[PDB]
Amino acid sequence: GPVPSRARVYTDVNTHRPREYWDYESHVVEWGNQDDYQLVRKLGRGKYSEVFEAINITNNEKVVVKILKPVKKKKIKREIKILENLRGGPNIITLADIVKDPVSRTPALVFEHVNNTDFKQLYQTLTDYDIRFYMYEILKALDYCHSMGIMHRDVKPHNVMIDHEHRKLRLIDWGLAEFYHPGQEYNVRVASRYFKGPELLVDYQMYDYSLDMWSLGCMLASMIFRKEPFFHGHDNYDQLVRIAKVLGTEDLYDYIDKYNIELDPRFNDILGRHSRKRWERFVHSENQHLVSPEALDFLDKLLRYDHQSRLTAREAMEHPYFYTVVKD
Ligand SMILES: COc1cc(/C=C/C(C)=O)ccc1O
C-alpha cells in the first residue's frame, strides 16, 4: 500500500487540544437574531453558498452575510467550528454572528465587512513591493491556522480578499477547511483545479497543511510571472501534466515512488518525459520588475512535488524575499 505521511510541524496540535476543539460534530451553535441583519445586495453565488452585502441595524454597520446552501450538517458545523476556533487570528475573516435564515432554512454566517478589489484587476497593478507585502500577510493567516491545527484546502486568489486602499487582507471561505490529525486520510477532491497539489492529483490522501503551501506557490507564480493561472490544466489529469512539464517527470516519479504511489494508467499516453525547467524561462520584459533571485528561490521552495519538502508557513516568513517588506 501507500507509505504513511505526517506533517513536519504542528503535528499533534489537535491531539493535545481538548476534544471539544476539533470534534465539530458535537458543536452546539449559538444563534443570534436574524432580524439584526438586512440584506442589501447579492455579491455572489458559489456551489455551497450565496453571499450578500448587508447592514447590521443594531449599529448601522456593513457586514457580509453568507447563506449556506443545504449540505451535510457536518460540513456546516465544520466550517462554523473552524471559524470560531480561528476568530481573532491574523488576517482570518472574522465570524461576527450566526443566524437561521427563514427562507433558505439554513445557517447564515455573518462576517466583518471586507471592501474588495477584484483580484483579476488587482493583480494587473500590483507592484513588486505589493506582492511581497500581501504574500507575507497571507503567510500570517496560514501559519496561524496551521498552528491551530487547521488546513484551509482552498487557497486561491478568489479566497484572498484584499482592501488595497487600507492594505488589508482577509483569508475567506473556510468551507473546505479541515482539522489535521496525524495519519488521517482526507478527501482529495478539494481546492480549485489550478491550485490542487500533486498529492491530490495522484490521489494521495494522507496530506496535511503543506497542501496550502503548494496552492500559495501557484498564486505566487501567477503574480510574479503575470500568468493567471500559472498551471492551466483542462482537467485534473492535464493539470498534473502541466505541472510535470515544469517540475519534470523524473522528480514526479521520485515523489510517487517515495510514497509507493501508483499513477493512474491513463497517464501512460499523456504524461511523456520532461526535464525540470529553470524558473528564468518564465521571465520576460513584461514581468521582470516583479522577479528577483529571492522571488525565484522562494517560489522554487514552495512548488515541490513532495509535500514534505515544501517550506512551512513559518519558514516561508523567514525567507529573504520578505526582507524588504516593512515589519509592523
Ligand atoms: C464565500 O465565502 C466567504 C465569502 C466572504 C466575502 C465575500 C465578499 C465580501 O465578496 C467572506 C467569508 C466567506 O467564508
Curated annotation (Swiss-Prot):
Q: What is the lineage of its organism?
A: Eukaryota, Metazoa, Chordata, Craniata, Vertebrata
Q: How is it modified after translation?
A: Phosphorylation does not directly affect casein kinase 2 activity, but may contribute to its regulation by forming binding sites for interacting proteins and/or targeting it to different compartments.
> Which source organism?
Homo sapiens
Q: Which GO terms describe its molecular function?
A: ATP binding; Hsp90 protein binding; identical protein binding; kinase activity; protein serine kinase activity; protein serine/threonine kinase activity
How activity is controlled: the entry says:
Constitutively active protein kinase whose activity is not directly affected by phosphorylation. Seems to be regulated by level of expression and localization.
Q: What is this protein called?
A: Casein kinase II subunit alpha
Q: How is the quaternary structure described?
A: Heterotetramer composed of two catalytic subunits (alpha chain and/or alpha' chain) and two regulatory subunits (beta chains). The tetramer can exist as a combination of 2 alpha/2 beta, 2 alpha'/2 beta or 1 alpha/1 alpha'/2 beta subunits. Also part of a CK2-SPT16-SSRP1 complex composed of SSRP1, SUPT16H, CSNK2A1, CSNK2A2 and CSNK2B, which forms following UV irradiation. Interacts with RNPS1. Interacts with SNAI1. Interacts with PML (isoform PML-12). Interacts with CCAR2. Interacts with HIRIP3.
Question: A GO biological process this protein is involved in?
Answer: negative regulation of proteasomal ubiquitin-dependent protein catabolic process
Give the family, as the similarity comment puts it: Belongs to the protein kinase superfamily. Ser/Thr protein kinase family. CK2 subfamily.
